[PDB]
Design a protein around this ligand. Structure first.
Ligand code: HEM
Length: 153
């Protein structure tokens, strides 16, 4: 479990992310899609996007970057008591979207890269450590729901 001090580091940076959810959403999805091109194939709606310039220009991409960070922030702010928030998500990502756990590991690294590039002073090594723990917690709970449904992985 994260301590109360680790939760404070997490949410302190997250309140900065919430200053500009759309720009953060953008960076994180584009980092995901460039670093791990196989992830872009899961999105029928982004499949046509072939360059970084085209991704930066898509309003739909930026809109759905807000969708992802908003659902994430709702989870983070439950400081581990996230059962009602996480359940629906795992269900649709296991059974409808078919997203393996490993991809949730990729987007975790993209989130951490982008926080570091945008918020140095609030994202030192202690906060990086705390955010990695929170992201591991979220992955571990999702993985348990996956296993139950027959998708573990
Ligand atoms: C930090 C984790 C992520 C969160 C919080 C998250 C959240 C969301 C939300 C809230 C929706 C819409 C409602 C739903 O369908 O249940 C959604 C849709 C979707 N998510 Fe995610 N997601 C995340 C990670 C991923 C990743 C890593 C991928 C793919 C590599 C993925 C693929 C999808 C797809 C394919 C859809 C449907 C888009 C559409 O309707 O065209 N998700 N996700």
């Amino acid at each position: 479990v994260l301590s109360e001090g680790e939760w404070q580091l997490v949410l302190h940076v997250w309140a900065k992310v919430e200053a500009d959810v759309a720009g953060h959403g953008q960076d994180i999805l584009i980092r995901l899609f460039k670093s791990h091109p196989e992830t872009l194939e899961k999105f029928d709606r982004f499949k046509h996007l072939k360059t970084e310039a085209e991704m930066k220009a898509s309003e739909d991409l930026k809109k759905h970057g807000v969708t992802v960070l908003t659902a994430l922030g709702a989870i983070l702010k439950k400081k581990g008591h996230h059962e009602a928030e996480l359940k629906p998500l795992a269900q649709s990502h296991a059974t409808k979207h078919k997203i393996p756990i490993k991809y949730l590991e990729f987007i975790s690294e993209a989130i951490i890269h982008v926080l570091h590039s945008r918020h140095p002073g609030d994202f030192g090594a202690d906060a990086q450590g705390a955010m990695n723990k929170a992201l591991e917690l979220f992955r571990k709970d999702i993985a348990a729901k996956y296993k139950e449904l027959g998708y573990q992985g």
